[PDB]
Amino acid sequence: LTNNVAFQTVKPGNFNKDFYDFAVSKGFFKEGSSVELKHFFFAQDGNAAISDYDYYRYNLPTMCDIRQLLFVVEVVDKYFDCYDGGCINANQVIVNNLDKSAGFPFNKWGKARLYYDSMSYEDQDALFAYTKRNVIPTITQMNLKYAISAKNRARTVAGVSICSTMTNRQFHQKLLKSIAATRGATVVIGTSKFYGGWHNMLKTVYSDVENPHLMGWDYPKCDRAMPNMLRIMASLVLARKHTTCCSLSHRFYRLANECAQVLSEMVMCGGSLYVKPGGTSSGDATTAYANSVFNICQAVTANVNALLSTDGNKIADKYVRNLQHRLYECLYRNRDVDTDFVNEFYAYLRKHFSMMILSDDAVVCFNSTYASQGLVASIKNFKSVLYYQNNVFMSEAKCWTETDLTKGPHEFCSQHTMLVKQGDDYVYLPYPDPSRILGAGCFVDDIVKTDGTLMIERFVSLAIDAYPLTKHPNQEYADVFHLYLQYIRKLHDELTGHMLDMYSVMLTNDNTSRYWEPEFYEAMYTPHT
Amino acid sequence: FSSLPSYAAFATAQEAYEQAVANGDSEVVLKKLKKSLNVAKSEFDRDAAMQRKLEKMADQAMTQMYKQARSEDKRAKVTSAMQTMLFTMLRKLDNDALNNIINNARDGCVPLNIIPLTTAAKLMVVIPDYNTYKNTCDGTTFTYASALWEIQQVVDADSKIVQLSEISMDNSPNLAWPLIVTALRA
Amino acid sequence: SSLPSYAAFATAQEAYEQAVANGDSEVVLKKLKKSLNVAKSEFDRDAAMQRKLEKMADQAMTQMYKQARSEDKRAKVTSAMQTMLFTMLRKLDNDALNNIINNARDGCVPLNIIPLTTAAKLMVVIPDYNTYKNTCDGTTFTYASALWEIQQVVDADSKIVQLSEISMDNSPNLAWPLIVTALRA
Amino acid sequence: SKMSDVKCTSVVLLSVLQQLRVESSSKLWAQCVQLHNDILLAKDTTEAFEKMVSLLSVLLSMQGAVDINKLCEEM
Amino acid sequence: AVGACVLCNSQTSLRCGACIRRPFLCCKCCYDHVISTSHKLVLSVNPYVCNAPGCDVTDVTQLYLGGMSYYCKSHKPPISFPLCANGQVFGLYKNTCVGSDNVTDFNAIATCDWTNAGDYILANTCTERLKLFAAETLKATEETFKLSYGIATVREVLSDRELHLSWEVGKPRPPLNRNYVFTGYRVTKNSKVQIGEYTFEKGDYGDAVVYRGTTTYKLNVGDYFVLTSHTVMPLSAPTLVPQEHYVRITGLYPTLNISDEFSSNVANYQKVGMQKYSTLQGPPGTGKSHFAIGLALYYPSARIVYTACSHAAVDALCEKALKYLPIDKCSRIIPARARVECFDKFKVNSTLEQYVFCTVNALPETTADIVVFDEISMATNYDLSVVNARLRAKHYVYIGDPAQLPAPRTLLTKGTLEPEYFNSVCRLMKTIGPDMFLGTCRRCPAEIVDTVSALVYDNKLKAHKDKSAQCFKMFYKGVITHDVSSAINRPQIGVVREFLTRNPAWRKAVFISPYNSQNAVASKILGLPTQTVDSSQGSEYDYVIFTQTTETAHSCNVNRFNVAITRAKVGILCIMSDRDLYDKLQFTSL
RNA sequence: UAAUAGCUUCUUAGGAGAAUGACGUAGCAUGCUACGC
RNA sequence: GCGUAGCAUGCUACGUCAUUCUCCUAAGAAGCUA
């Protein structure tokens, strides 16, 4: 568009010298330490956005197996059968934050609040109904992220404009907020890790598994290597709740709008319009949920491949040999749905391959005996499935397997979990990486966050997040919580000193006394509230 | 509240109470006048408490209406900005070649990716290193998209002018790559 | 609590406590308890709305401090965090950085980035004969606690100059300052 | 504590360089961010230290943006 | 917002209200300022007026603070305390406060009106911060009083984004400045009160102005806007950098066998070299404007920025560098105003070159290696603070002579100013003496220089020239018509009319007069190139027709007579009216 | 230039509900008193 | 024995206020995860 190509860089982080000096005065950051700074604010040159958009070259046009995908679709829909959804009017769509951006070219005149206030409900419903029989191509910006991370590559997020976002919210928000309000299901979205929510999720994982073993894989380049077919499938599975509100042509045109606004459309990279070959833009209205559908698809496809690729004469259980026979005849010998066998296979999967999904992170409590025999998906099955349906290689180096159920999964949502004693029983508490917490404390992304005395909520929230480290067997893992607590104590003391010097009156209700004693953080992980 | 006639009733009842205190009348008269004072209090306190929430809701509706008016005035401004942007981009259009390629079409529909490929009068090549410069736009004229373009300007990543004799094999490290050459259709 | 309605409550306290110290009976006791309760309530009201006054002032003061310190933190930071960089740099106490910025103090600043690979070009300006005497001995050039050999000595006249004439009695004859080109050994 | 000590000095030095608008020169900003990201990902004391020397040399070449003499007598 | 106190530099938030510049002021310092002077308004983060629906009690010693508001004696709350108690004014940072005795001079600085000639003396002997504050409020008061304003009223309200303007014809109009303010003057019956503080930037279409106001009140039909008060930039740098003495040459690189002309001043270039700032004093036409180029050719590798308060001095310096310095990279800086013609033969507007030519009000915020401030006689403390805040160099050079003219100072109409009280540099060079010196006249002939070597200097200045004997002294009435409040003398230009036909060697002469009106009208009468005494300082003139018009304290000063007569390098004709000044000159008597 | 979704902490404002206490009005019951029947 | 009036006590309904708690919404600040 403009006459010169714009180059955008990323500034480095801002050092909080007070916090680091307090840390090194408390015996931290030595040699021989198990805890040193590993999450920093990495900076980038002017070739960051263009060299990160180039990673879409890993997205190849992938032709998925169709006689098997048309059954994995049924299994995924059975996984998504508890929820309800449909279309909602413009006066029922609720936005979380109105000050967020509105993409291109709507960022030139204001934020999203301008377009949610200038447009009434009537012409919002008019636009939504227009999209149900029309296609609106859309430009999506690529925004460089200014955030803390453990590796130096620039991460980018795709900024979808408001014209696609409002219609997608009106289409999907009922189902998206029904998923985020159900507890004990496969897709754990909307479930907190506080107030014993982690323990509840982790005990709903362990629901009827025979000889339990824990497994978790990783998708390399998850959002950039996905085939267009799996994204279209996810958009169709999320659109299977509109069997009453929407007609067939309306649903097809909504799918077309999703593909024209999300999957393969023009991408803005520094004042220049390119073409997105495919894969999900990670900033649209349905990204965590569609990615969860994709992850469940890959798991079910791995299970089907593992079950079919087994010999058949070595099959000890005589039922499951018949189940494999029926699986093959329902894959490659039937053209209509066999709902009885779909129910049976879904029950088999929920019985032997219990799962827990948040959009690319899965913790599975698969049967160990069946996996050793080869009747449920294992690591190598997922590797093969990602090789021939995702065009990426899944190495074992970052995918774990836990053989002891008393220590939980190795890593879920970047939170290590462990078994502790609370009260009279035992619960699981997720503890983060202390390097991450120390890096967040030391490296702020602004100047007003460096002073400290202005922001006590930052360190209170960090102490809330890093409380479970005290129950860890390693001592200097546990010392992080006390470091943050003494830092809050000193911060409050010097804030009171400064506000005693800049006035003559000391605050009558200084309510901070509970932030530096462990009851406020201990009550955070108790299942009463 | 303080302007209501029930305040006048309460005030005259209280004046009667203080006048009877100054008079020192009988207990029955004082009790009756106290009953009158208490019912006046019961009326006026209730009415004032009703009016307080009334002022609250009046302020709330006032604020909502004020916000809605400002929203309308912002809507007009963004509408004007969008109209001006659209009409300026119309003034930027190259109507002759666009009309030619649209009239060549059957339905009148053409893919969007070929509109600049056949009607744009100015082209920009972004060149990461020297070998690609030697391979795509060597010299002062080059051929892309089945047309002939003449290089009018070469700028580096810092938007500084680079003369075409500056781009050599040995002089490549001294240039701030990438190079953005600008060419016009001939 | 230093209020006139507090005085009304305190005299109700004294009067009805004295009445209980008598405590015989009965009607004056109940009526005086009624008066004590009404004084309690009318004091309680303005005490609570006084709560509201000091907490409204808590908005006033907390907003006040946050906004002031906001561009208090903005205005200082650039020069102030340069000072932070130098204090914390000096805390390292590495002889290479010490040597380099003590040479920078005298005016011996490099004209380009110092290369790290072996046998790569560095050009640094020499501002004094004493600075040359300390760092260059023979054809060698010590800098950043590293060994460099000389390709250029060259002056402000851009005249090709050779290595021997830089001496005690020939130093004023030079066109100062001199620019050296060196490689890393 | 000598190792976690350089890794913050690189951050503050790059922030100072960004303050003095090295960002407007893409070529220089290239090895500025290069050395910054490499020092953050360092294992030994040495390469961290002469990469520190190379990154500080960017601030060294700068005559008028810094004034070297004030920021080092009172400290 | 918070700030620092003026006379003690302590943290504070109490602005004074009736001071002209609206400065920041302390607690005890503000108590002493408002308890001894007529200034009674004080601006905290909120104004200290009473908070009754109708009440105007703006004095601070007079109110009470109850709750969170300011109330008067009549409207006081039962629980409160007065603001001015225990010797302080209520404000932020109450007990982190320290006072001083600088209020004895601060009260006189903030109280005076700057038309006397003793407050100017007070504004140059006190401490540095009070010097800066006095100069700042001098500039503010000058901008308030001189060339004040024209009345403007608003006809109708188009919108709150664009305004209507109507200047009153008969008075001029000041232009856009956010530093300028037009105070609201709905003065009718009916609230002759400040309704706000406004500035006006004009539009490109129709009769409209897109204003910027600091109030939330709509305009009345009778509301007016006359420019009272102005805000100048609050500079921070001192008038003079503190002196530091060196031993050897630092930051500079000398040359051997520099040239033939500058060989006499080589020891001078050293003594410039090992001092932080050095001062040069010399009678006019001795080479002060030549010493800068001598410094340039003695220190070749170093950048030097050459700057003066006016444009004529920097242009003469341009000329001398044009003949002696390399033409290839030399610079010249013109402002964005571009009001007047400049020396456009080098690169105009190139701040990154080794020899930068500029004027004090238009310097860029860059570095240097030597700075040479020319003709401090045109420099006030404001200009010195400007060049100190904007230019940041190893060496400062201050060249000039106090015997030449000081700054205009149009407020100064009573009393006399000594040369040592023009600014801080003059106070240095006249009290403790200049560092180094030259006196020898090579510009005006021996006759006229012998005349002036008794009036301003008592016989410390000789010449190396002849008495060419065309310094004609004439004494006539020259009837004075007082037209434009600037003197016009038609019979004076008439005796000059008819004394030019008799002299064939004076057809190249230049007309000089201390009054701009007669000066300008002399253009069509007799056709010679025409210059005033103020703007002709610096350039050398072959033949000069000086014409003293009136008898007063304005044109009869010996200093302006000195500069007007000493610019005639070979001959001059002087017209006159005085008798004390005619008694001491040694001219041909006619 | 700064995306979507989820969770959590803190601060304010408003509403609703619950609980406790206090004052006032109305209704019912018990005891006592004045007078009349 | 009945009525009217008055006082004391208990209970219920309503009005108001104070205190505490919960929730629902709005706004603002922050942290973490995908």
Ligand SMILES: Nc1ncnc2c1ncn2[C@@H]1O[C@H](COP(=O)(O)OP(=O)(O)O)[C@@H](O)[C@H]1O
């Ligand atoms: N040493 C010298 N030898 C010859 N001529 C000189 C010498 N010094 C100065 N001059 C001449 O005298 C003139 C002095 O001009 P200027 O510097 O404006 O004097 P001032 O600054 O003292 O008023 C110059 O034009 C120069 O040509």
Ligand SMILES: [Mg+2]
């Ligand atoms: Mg001169």
Ligand SMILES: [Zn+2]
């Ligand atoms: Zn629908």
Ligand SMILES: [Zn+2]
């Ligand atoms: Zn004052």
Ligand SMILES: [Zn+2]
């Ligand atoms: Zn003070």
Ligand SMILES: [Zn+2]
């Ligand atoms: Zn008042």
